[PDB]
């Protein structure tokens, strides 16, 4: 029910602050987008640009996505990002995350029409 590009922006858009303030950034951020609902999500990364900065890099840097496919792109400056991982103690229902932040080139899988975001590959 969700469409591929709005669960996208549900998992890593966070516009409303330009960076992680604390280390409990994570924490906090993983609950309140409901990615702790049935399991621990183990890796995930927030950004802090606008929208409309996020959808412009579909039409930047082509790359090869992790799994061989061609509809990557790299932006080609950096962005304020937040890279979440679970601790190794985490255990679900007590999901536990390490907080970076960081600036670092995005790369993202594009689809649709409009060519939008629809999965976050990796941070540079």
């Given at each position: 029910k969700e469409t591929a590009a709005a669960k996208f922006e549900r998992?890593?858009?966070d516009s409303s602050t330009s960076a992680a303030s604390?280390?409990?950034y994570c924490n906090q951020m993983m609950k309140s987008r409901n990615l702790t609902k049935d399991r621990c999500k183990p890796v995930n990364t927030f950004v802090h640009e606008s929208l409309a900065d996020v959808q412009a890099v579909c039409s930047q840097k082509n790359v090869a996505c992790k799994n061989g496919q061609t509809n990557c792109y790299q932006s080609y400056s950096t962005?304020?990002?937040t890279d979440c991982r679970e601790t190794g103690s985490s255990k679900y229902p007590n999901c536990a995350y390490k907080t970076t932040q960081a600036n670092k080139?995005?790369?993202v899988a594009c689809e649709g029409?409009?060519?939008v975001?629809?999965?976050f590959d990796?941070?540079?």
């Open positions: 998992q890593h858009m604390s280390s409990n962005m304020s990002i080139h995005i790369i029409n409009p060519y975001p629809v999965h990796a941070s540079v």
